[PDB]
């Protein structure tokens, strides 16, 4: 019994050493090389495991049903079931067997080639054939492609057919002036270490028709990942890169030759898009005559993911931002379909997945506007557009009388001298302000006063009926929206700021479009939806239908009244209920004050579309309303 427990522990340590990849550690637990003892030396056992288990990318060896008994005074037989993960899948129901040797004070494994794979004997080889799986496509709601696998035009040069001295410089300047590329860049490419005289040196992917090819230039068609929309949806879709040795160490079922998504949806749906590697792992004899086929299954190409995105709306929404910092979310508020998730500025996913230089990538990672940020999923303060929610809450608890008129003098206001130097600021010096006037002129002083009259308790009771703290069911990496840092404001100033949407509030544009959807469903919140096949989830009785029928007509006047903040949208001549907003941002790291411009708009007649747009750190005389003329036309025409 005492010697039997050491045998089991030896087997346990042996499998553990194999599971952690330490083959030398496992090989040093084997007995001496002999006929009935071990079959190979320690170094030979190391090489056999490293070669065989490394070719199949074996990882995660786990055992069960371990039984160690006794055969003689020094031989102890053992047996266990085992399972492992390979490049083709999981090998299950593996019946291993062997013996041990307690010659001295140490039990050692009588190593045999059947401890690699069950039915291996003598000098049996292992063969692994694999067929790559084609990565699936990402399409919009109408089948238009957002991420596909197509043929690309690879522009490159051969240093031998280029020239010696003079002709080489002239052709490089000709291949540089014809394809828009630095003359020093072509020389740096053809002079790298790996380059040999008669090699094809790739340079740039051409997305149009082939221009004139000077001497040495040649195009070679290669298949690779292609993104039609380009930077317009680079943050949403993401990109794919070459699979590295560490990625295979993490997941052996990846292709050691394929592509893996690095960000966005290409990464979120990498398992559903990469497919499963087909092939056959088998045990062959001395040559290539197969004995036992361990694993085998046909190749399964990746599935296709169909999004709710509208391809043209996504392109229009991104281009409308004009390269500035901001985001735009367009939805169908009754179903939650995400028609567009634009984020600007952006990067080139085609340049990212093909040939990207360490200089252009550094330019993408140092731009203070940070193009890599998915701004539709980044938590921001909602701005003065949030007064709608504060008003809708005030109408449900009877705090806000739509006809009651507050008397406000000036542009700054504070409850008490206790506030110190902080004052709620408004842009329009309107004396007699009621609810309708406050929404037209975007009066923060009205909202700050009604919020304080409402009280923290009633205000949070209305806010808690929304989606604060909820993790949305979307394949987009996101943090849930918060009302503040803690569950209590503990500051009348912070409560007033939260009234008009800029305290410790953090709500990303997707969560904003969710909360604002109540105005298109009579107080019923419709969760956003990105996958076309999913069902519409809703949250009924968020705000009162009385509040919606009171605020939406006022939101119409935001566009129709000549002093409305969105009156420039009346140029469209379409039914529009809209709301604008601003947000002042100034932390300790900020130089001066940075302002964010917001616009919320939707069709109040048919509820066919809804739009929220933001301009982060706006330039002077710039606004989200200024750039929303085109997207609103498209959504009004194509989504009734």
Catalytic positions, please? 384
CA-nearest of 232, 218, 291 to 264 is 232
Q: 75-85 and 59-68 as β-strands: parallel, antiparallel, unpaired?
A: antiparallel
DSSP string, 184-228: HHHHHHTTSSS--TT--EEEEEE-SS-----TTEEEEEEEEEE-S
Structure token pair of residue 616: 């982060």
Please state whether beta strands 138-139 and 305-306 pair in parallel, antiparallel, or not at all (unpaired).
parallel
Q: Which residue has the tokens 């009621």?
A: 434
Q: Which letter does DSSP use for residue 415 in this model?
A: S
Rg (CA), the chain: 33
- Rounded Cα gap, residues 235 and 374, in angstroms: 5
**Cα–Cα distance measured from residue 595 to residue 616, given in angstroms and rounded to the nearest whole number:** 7
Decide: 252 and 108 in contact? Cβ < 8 Å: no
How far is the C-alpha of 27 from the C-alpha of 42, rounded, in Å?
A: 5
Residue 51's SS3 state is helix
Report CA dihedral (424, 426, 431, 433) to the nearest 10 degrees.
Answer: -90
Residue 298 backbone zone (phi > 0: left; psi -120 to 50: alpha; other: beta): beta
Q: How many CB atoms lie within 10 A of CB 325?
A: 22
User: Taking the CB of residue 41, how many other CB atoms lie within 10 A of it?
Assistant: 14
Peptide linkage before 345 cis (omega within 30 of 0): yes
What's the CA gap between 67 and 82, in Å, rounded? 13
């Amino acid at each position: 019994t005492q010697a039997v427990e050491a045998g089991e522990k030896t087997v346990e340590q042996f499998v553990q050493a194999l599971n952690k990849g330490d083959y030398n550690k496992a090989a040093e637990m084997t007995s001496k090389k002999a006929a009935n003892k071990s079959a190979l030396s320690e170094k030979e056992i190391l090489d056999k495991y490293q070669n065989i288990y490394g070719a199949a990318d074996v990882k995660g060896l786990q055992i069960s049903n371990l039984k160690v008994d006794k055969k003689d005074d020094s031989t102890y037989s053992f047996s266990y079931k085992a399972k492992m993960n390979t490049s083709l899948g999981e090998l299950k129901d593996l019946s291993y067997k062997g013996t041990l040797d307690r010659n001295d004070g140490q039990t050692t494994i009588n190593w045999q080639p059947n401890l690699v794979f069950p039915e291996m004997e003598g000098n049996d080889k292992v063969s692994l054939t694999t067929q790559e799986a084609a990565r699936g496509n990402i399409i919009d709601r109408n089948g238009e492609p957002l991420a596909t696998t197509g043929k690309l035009k690879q522009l490159g040069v051969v240093p031998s057919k280029l020239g010696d001295g003079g002709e080489k410089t002239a052709n490089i300047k000709a291949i540089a002036s014809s394809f828009d590329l630095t003359e020093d860049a072509i020389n740096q490419a053809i002079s790298q270490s790996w380059v040999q005289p008669d090699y094809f040196v790739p340079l740039k992917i051409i997305d149009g028709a082939t221009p004139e090819l000077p001497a040495g230039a040649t195009i070679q068609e290669v298949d690779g990942r292609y993104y039609p929309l380009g930077e317009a949806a680079a943050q949403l879709i993401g990109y794919v890169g070459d699979i590295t040795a560490e990625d295979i160490d993490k997941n052996p079922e990846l292709s050691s030759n394929g592509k893996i998504g690095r960000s966005g949806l290409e990464m979120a749906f990498d398992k559903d898009l990469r497919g499963t590697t087909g092939g056959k792992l088998s045990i062959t004899d001395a040559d290539g005559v197969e004995k036992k086929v361990l694993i085998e299954h046909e190749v399964q190409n990746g599935k296709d993911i169909k999004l709710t995105i509208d391809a043209k709306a996504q392109k229009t929404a991104f281009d409308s931002l004009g390269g500035k910092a901001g985001s735009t979310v367009a939805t169908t508020p009754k179903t939650g379909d995400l028609l567009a998730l634009a984020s600007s500025p952006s990067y080139d996913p085609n340049k990212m997945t093909n040939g990207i230089s360490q200089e252009d990538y550094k330019a993408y990672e140092e731009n203070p506007e940070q193009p890599f940020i998915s701004r539709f999923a980044t938590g921001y303060a909602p701005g003065s557009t949030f007064k709608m929610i504060t008003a809708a809450i005030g109408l449900d608890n009877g705090t806000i009388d739509p006809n009651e008129v507050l008397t406000i003098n000036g542009l700054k206001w504070q409850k008490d001298s206790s506030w110190g130097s902080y004052q709620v600021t408004r842009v329009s010096d309107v004396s007699q302000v009621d609810l309708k006037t406050a929404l037209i002129y975007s009066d923060n002083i009205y909202t700050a006063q009604e919020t304080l009259k409402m009280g923290e308790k009633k205000f949070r009771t209305g806010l808690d009926k929304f989606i604060f703290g909820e993790d949305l069911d979307l394949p987009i990496s996101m943090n849930p929206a918060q009302i503040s840092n803690e569950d209590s404001f503990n500051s009348d100033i912070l409560l007033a700021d939260t009234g008009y949407g800029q305290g410790e509030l953090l709500i990303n544009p997707i969560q904003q479009a969710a909360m604002y959807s109540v105005f298109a469903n009579n107080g019923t919140l419709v969760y956003p939806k990105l996958i076309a096949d999913k069902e519409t989830k809703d949250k009924k009785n968020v705000i009162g239908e009385t509040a919606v029928q009171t605020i939406v007509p006022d939101l119409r006047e935001v566009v129709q009244d000549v002093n409305g903040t969105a009156h420039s949208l009346s140029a469209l001549g379409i039914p529009l209920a809209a709301k604008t907003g601003t947000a002042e941002i100034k932390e300790k790291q900020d130089v001066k004050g940075k302002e964010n411009s917001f616009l919320f708009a939707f069709n109040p007649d048919n509820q066919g579309y809804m739009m929220v747009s933001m301009l982060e750190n706006k330039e002077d005389d710039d606004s989200a309303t200024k750039r929303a003329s085109e997207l609103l036309q498209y959504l009004n025409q194509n989504y009734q």
